[PDB]
Enzyme design. Structure first.
Site, mmCIF file in Angstrom:
data_model
loop_
_atom_site.group_PDB
_atom_site.id
_atom_site.type_symbol
_atom_site.label_atom_id
_atom_site.label_comp_id
_atom_site.label_asym_id
_atom_site.label_seq_id
_atom_site.Cartn_x
_atom_site.Cartn_y
_atom_site.Cartn_z
ATOM 1 N N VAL A 1 35.722 29.014 43.095
ATOM 2 C CA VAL A 1 36.469 29.404 44.294
ATOM 3 C C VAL A 1 36.336 31.273 44.501
ATOM 4 O O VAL A 1 37.166 31.600 45.567
ATOM 5 C CB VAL A 1 37.715 28.659 44.879
ATOM 6 C CG1 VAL A 1 38.284 28.026 43.580
ATOM 7 C CG2 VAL A 1 38.778 29.718 45.300
ATOM 8 N N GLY A 2 35.975 31.788 43.610
ATOM 9 C CA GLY A 2 35.972 33.307 43.719
ATOM 10 C C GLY A 2 36.807 33.942 42.607
ATOM 11 O O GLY A 2 37.994 33.549 42.433
ATOM 12 N N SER A 3 36.535 35.137 42.061
ATOM 13 C CA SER A 3 37.292 36.190 41.505
ATOM 14 C C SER A 3 37.810 37.167 42.483
ATOM 15 O O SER A 3 39.018 37.024 42.774
ATOM 16 C CB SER A 3 36.272 37.099 40.522
ATOM 17 O OG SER A 3 35.337 36.268 39.988
ATOM 18 N N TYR B 1 39.926 40.564 36.376
ATOM 19 C CA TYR B 1 40.736 39.663 35.597
ATOM 20 C C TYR B 1 40.545 38.373 35.462
ATOM 21 O O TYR B 1 40.969 37.862 34.540
ATOM 22 C CB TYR B 1 42.009 39.971 36.462
ATOM 23 N N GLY B 2 39.620 37.839 36.109
ATOM 24 C CA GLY B 2 39.093 36.691 35.869
ATOM 25 C C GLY B 2 38.573 35.720 37.054
ATOM 26 O O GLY B 2 38.810 36.170 38.333
ATOM 27 N N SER B 3 37.739 34.810 36.776
ATOM 28 C CA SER B 3 37.405 33.689 37.950
ATOM 29 C C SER B 3 37.802 32.343 37.816
ATOM 30 O O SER B 3 38.433 31.642 36.696
ATOM 31 C CB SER B 3 35.869 33.804 37.820
ATOM 32 O OG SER B 3 35.353 33.038 36.835
ATOM 33 N N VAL B 4 38.144 31.650 39.156
ATOM 34 C CA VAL B 4 39.050 30.364 39.048
ATOM 35 C C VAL B 4 37.903 29.228 39.510
ATOM 36 O O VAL B 4 37.278 29.504 40.598
ATOM 37 C CB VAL B 4 40.201 30.584 39.975
ATOM 38 C CG1 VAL B 4 40.833 29.217 40.192
ATOM 39 C CG2 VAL B 4 40.986 31.619 39.490
ATOM 40 N N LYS C 1 41.672 28.899 35.864
ATOM 41 C CA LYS C 1 41.051 30.332 35.521
ATOM 42 C C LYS C 1 40.759 30.591 34.224
ATOM 43 O O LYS C 1 41.286 30.252 33.230
ATOM 44 C CB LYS C 1 42.447 31.398 35.983
ATOM 45 C CG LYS C 1 42.237 32.721 35.725
ATOM 46 C CD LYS C 1 43.117 33.619 36.089
ATOM 47 C CE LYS C 1 43.071 34.985 36.095
ATOM 48 N NZ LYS C 1 44.498 35.806 36.460
ATOM 49 N N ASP D 1 51.046 34.937 40.298
ATOM 50 C CA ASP D 1 50.641 36.301 39.554
ATOM 51 C C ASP D 1 49.684 37.268 40.140
ATOM 52 O O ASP D 1 49.803 38.346 40.135
ATOM 53 C CB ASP D 1 50.546 35.689 38.074
ATOM 54 C CG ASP D 1 49.431 34.949 37.839
ATOM 55 O OD1 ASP D 1 49.110 34.363 38.655
ATOM 56 O OD2 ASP D 1 48.763 34.768 36.736
HETATM 57 O O1 LIG Z 1 44.887 32.298 40.401
HETATM 58 C C1 LIG Z 1 45.053 31.002 40.263
HETATM 59 C C2 LIG Z 1 45.592 30.756 38.792
HETATM 60 C C3 LIG Z 1 44.665 29.455 38.222
HETATM 61 C C4 LIG Z 1 45.101 29.019 36.784
HETATM 62 C C5 LIG Z 1 46.410 29.602 36.180
HETATM 63 C C6 LIG Z 1 47.116 30.421 36.923
HETATM 64 C C7 LIG Z 1 46.750 31.140 38.318
HETATM 65 N N1 LIG Z 1 45.224 30.329 41.323
HETATM 66 C C8 LIG Z 1 44.687 30.924 42.732
HETATM 67 C C9 LIG Z 1 45.130 30.089 44.063
HETATM 68 C C10 LIG Z 1 45.196 28.740 44.024
HETATM 69 C C11 LIG Z 1 45.980 28.200 42.839
HETATM 70 C C12 LIG Z 1 45.623 28.955 41.524
#
Ligand SMILES: O=C(c1ccccc1)N1CCCCC1
Ligand SMILES: Nc1ccc2c(NC3CC3)nc(-c3ccccc3)nc2c1
Length: 337
Positions: free
Chosen positions: A27-29, A30-33, A48, A161
């Protein structure tokens, strides 16, 4: 015992996640998810993968901070950890950190595409309830803004966060802009105020082009600091700067926010106060009349105490690396309900 991991390639980057998480989908990027399906619980989740968790001492600390903060958050309006895991089997090879939490779809930033007063009431109420809990742990968020607010289709809200890849500065308290080292929790309340303002009107309250511009726009609405605040500024430079500015009068908020709920406007007045010793707290804002239909003192909990003494440690890269590993290893899944 450990579970079966499985490997794939994704956004150019690679992912070694457990069997249990299926149908990864970036779904897009500290890291990608990744949005994925959690076969153990039935729910859609976000995974993530931290980029370069241990690349420097600062990355290594950041990676540890993030794990501690997430492992601590146990509250409806604040993002919690469903799962943390790594491909590594030993400390020696430990190199990748993945974080798992509930998928929520959208963020306030992109759902803004003007809401009704019942909605902003419910949305800001949930933020404040989140801040109560966070603030009660002596934690300040510092970067509250739409993209850091996650909202499912139930209109349910969770403070993130860190959010998806709209300036930081637009929502920052003026004292952080002036670089005050000693700001309190209510920098987050300021942010809330700016967000609430944006929902009621559909317009960024302070769309500054930079940190000078940003302060300009703030003082326009809220007025130059009176002498009571003026004397708390421990910095010749700042004191010179704003005392050199043109004296702006505090605008009437019912003139600016015309036809918004006059209770909403009252709250905004109590949140966008220049002097941060006088800004309403998250706990006191929840008791505001504006949230009478939502406010329930018996159901607005505070957090367990949070040990952040680690924030002051100057430690080796391999030392933060290994504290993290301990945090991964000691992780207890929350109960499935
Ligand atoms: O950045 C995160 C995330 C993913 C895994 C653990 C902590 C935060 N999210 C972004 C918005 C949708 C829910 C999760
Ligand atoms: N109790 C407080 C409340 C608000 C404050 C604020 N923010 C006001 C918009 C000017 N700024 C400053 C400060 C101190 C040193 C350098 C730069 C700024 N201190 C504040 C202390």
């Amino acid at each position: 015992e450990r579970p079966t991991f499985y490997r794939q390639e994704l956004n150019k980057t690679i992912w070694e996640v457990p069997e249990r998480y299926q149908n990864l989908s970036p779904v897009g990027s500290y890291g990608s998810v990744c949005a994925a399906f959690d076969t153990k619980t039935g729910l859609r989740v976000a995974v993530k993968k931290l980029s370069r968790p241990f690349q420097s001492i600062i990355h290594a600390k950041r990676t540890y901070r993030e794990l501690r903060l997430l492992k601590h958050m146990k509250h409806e309006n604040v993002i919690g950890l469903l799962d943390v895991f790594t491909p590594a089997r030993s400390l020696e090879e430990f190199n990748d950190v993945y974080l798992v939490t509930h998928l929520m779809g959208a963020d306030l930033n992109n759902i803004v595409k003007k809401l009704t007063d019942d909605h902003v009431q419910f949305l800001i109420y949930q933020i404040l309830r989140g801040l109560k809990y966070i603030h009660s742990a002596d934690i300040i968020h510092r970067d509250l803004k739409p993209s850091n607010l996650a909202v499912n289709e139930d209109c349910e809200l969770k403070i993130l966060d860190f959010g998806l890849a709209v300036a930081t500065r637009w929502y920052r308290a003026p004292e952080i802009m002036l670089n005050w080292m000693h700001y309190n929790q209510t920098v987050d309340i300021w942010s809330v105020g700016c967000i609430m303002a944006e929902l009621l009107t559909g317009r960024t309250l302070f769309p500054g082009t930079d940190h000078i511009d940003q302060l300009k726009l703030i003082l326009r609405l809220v007025g130059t600091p009176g002498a009571e605040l003026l004397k708390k500024i421990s910095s010749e430079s700042a004191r010179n700067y704003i005392q050199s500015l043109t004296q702006m009068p505090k605008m009437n908020f019912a003139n600016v926010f015309i036809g918004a709920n006059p209770l909403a406007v009252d709250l905004l007045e109590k949140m966008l106060v220049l002097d941060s010793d006088k800004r309403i707290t998250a706990a006191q804002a929840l008791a505001h009349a504006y949230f009478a239909q939502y406010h329930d003192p018996d159901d607005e909990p505070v957090a367990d105490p949070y040990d952040q003494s680690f924030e002051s440690r100057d430690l080796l890269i391999d030392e933060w690396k290994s504290l993290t590993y301990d945090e991964v290893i000691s992780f207890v899944p929350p109960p499935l309900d």
